[PDB]
Design a protein around this motif. Structure first.
Motif, PDB file in Angstrom:
ATOM      1  N   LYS A  95      53.033  49.141  28.933  1.00 53.63           N
ATOM      2  CA  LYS A  95      52.442  47.988  28.333  1.00 53.63           C
ATOM      3  C   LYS A  95      51.417  47.595  28.901  1.00 53.63           C
ATOM      4  CE  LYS A  95      56.264  45.363  27.485  1.00 53.63           C
ATOM      5  NZ  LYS A  95      57.337  44.397  27.684  1.00 53.63           N
ATOM      6  N   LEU A  96      50.315  47.028  27.940  1.00 56.04           N
ATOM      7  CA  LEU A  96      49.086  46.130  28.332  1.00 56.04           C
ATOM      8  C   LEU A  96      49.549  44.953  27.753  1.00 56.04           C
ATOM      9  CD1 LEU A  96      45.358  47.449  27.710  1.00 56.04           C
ATOM     10  CD2 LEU A  96      46.499  45.174  28.779  1.00 56.04           C
ATOM     11  N   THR A  97      49.134  44.082  28.481  1.00 51.47           N
ATOM     12  CA  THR A  97      49.162  42.666  28.377  1.00 51.47           C
ATOM     13  C   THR A  97      47.905  42.035  28.665  1.00 51.47           C
ATOM     14  OG1 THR A  97      50.197  40.435  28.616  1.00 51.47           O
ATOM     15  CG2 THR A  97      50.368  41.743  30.261  1.00 51.47           C
ATOM     16  N   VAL A  98      47.230  41.425  27.774  1.00 52.27           N
ATOM     17  CA  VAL A  98      45.716  40.943  27.737  1.00 52.27           C
ATOM     18  C   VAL A  98      45.368  39.841  28.501  1.00 52.27           C
ATOM     19  CG1 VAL A  98      43.851  40.874  25.884  1.00 52.27           C
ATOM     20  CG2 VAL A  98      45.640  42.033  25.494  1.00 52.27           C
ATOM     21  N   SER A  99      44.256  39.710  29.012  1.00 52.26           N
ATOM     22  CA  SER A  99      43.937  38.693  29.958  1.00 52.26           C
ATOM     23  C   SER A  99      43.042  37.683  28.883  1.00 52.26           C
ATOM     24  CB  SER A  99      42.896  38.766  30.923  1.00 52.26           C
ATOM     25  OG  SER A  99      43.064  37.858  32.175  1.00 52.26           O
ATOM     26  N   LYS A 100      43.106  36.341  29.251  1.00 51.75           N
ATOM     27  CA  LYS A 100      42.358  35.124  28.531  1.00 51.75           C
ATOM     28  C   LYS A 100      41.147  35.681  28.341  1.00 51.75           C
ATOM     29  CE  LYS A 100      39.914  31.070  28.627  1.00 51.75           C
ATOM     30  NZ  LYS A 100      38.434  30.684  29.277  1.00 51.75           N
ATOM     31  N   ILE A 101      39.972  36.011  28.867  1.00 54.10           N
ATOM     32  CA  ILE A 101      38.583  36.263  28.821  1.00 54.10           C
ATOM     33  C   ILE A 101      38.688  37.414  27.869  1.00 54.10           C
ATOM     34  CG2 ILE A 101      36.480  37.225  29.958  1.00 54.10           C
ATOM     35  CD1 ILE A 101      37.376  34.156  31.101  1.00 54.10           C
TER      36      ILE A 101
END
Lengths: 99, 99
Positions: free
Chosen positions: B84-90
């Motif tokens: 899984k990839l979970t995205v950062s805020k920026i």
């Protein structure tokens, strides 16, 4: 945060400097650029397909009415724009990581 | 539009040629070392946290324990091993933002 076995970008930076003489402080640069231009290609909303790890697609979750019957307010979740990763075969698909 | 690894490795050369920095057959190694080492580090059940983009981690369709007819040892019901990839805020805030 939660402690597990882990890597910062600085971990790979150190990994890269240990692997190669051709590069010095420029390793912090090259390791940001690797991901800066990934972030740029997603902002133009282009698929990045990196052969052997998979592909980074920009996605959106369309806005949708929600109703829970007991609340008076309808929490209607808006449009949010995100990235999905889809795996390459050689990394996941009964292969590398699954042995 | 989309973008390939080799096209990535080209656009890192045009920015990291300079007076001196890295050459065409070296830019070809850093790009591939990245995605190799990060795969090897999810192989060992580690989490890559890349500040600015987000975090890649393994996920395992949870193996139950079975006492299947063999020996005294417990035999796992087979897991499905994915990433899984979970995205950062920026990343997500610059995607949510219209250019």
């Amino acid at each position: 945060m939660a402690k597990i076995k882990s890597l910062s970008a600085a971990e790979y930076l150190k990994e890269m400097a240990d692997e190669t003489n051709i590069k010095v402080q420029d390793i912090r640069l090259v390791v940001t650029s690797l991901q800066k231009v990934l972030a740029k290609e997603l902002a133009t909303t282009g698929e990045v397909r990196l052969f052997d790890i998979g592909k980074f697609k920009l996605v959106t979750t369309k806005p949708r009415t929600g109703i829970n019957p007991k609340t008076k307010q309808k929490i209607q979740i808006p449009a949010g724009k995100k990235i999905k990763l889809t795996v390459s075969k050689i990394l996941t698909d009964a292969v590398d990581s699954h042995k």
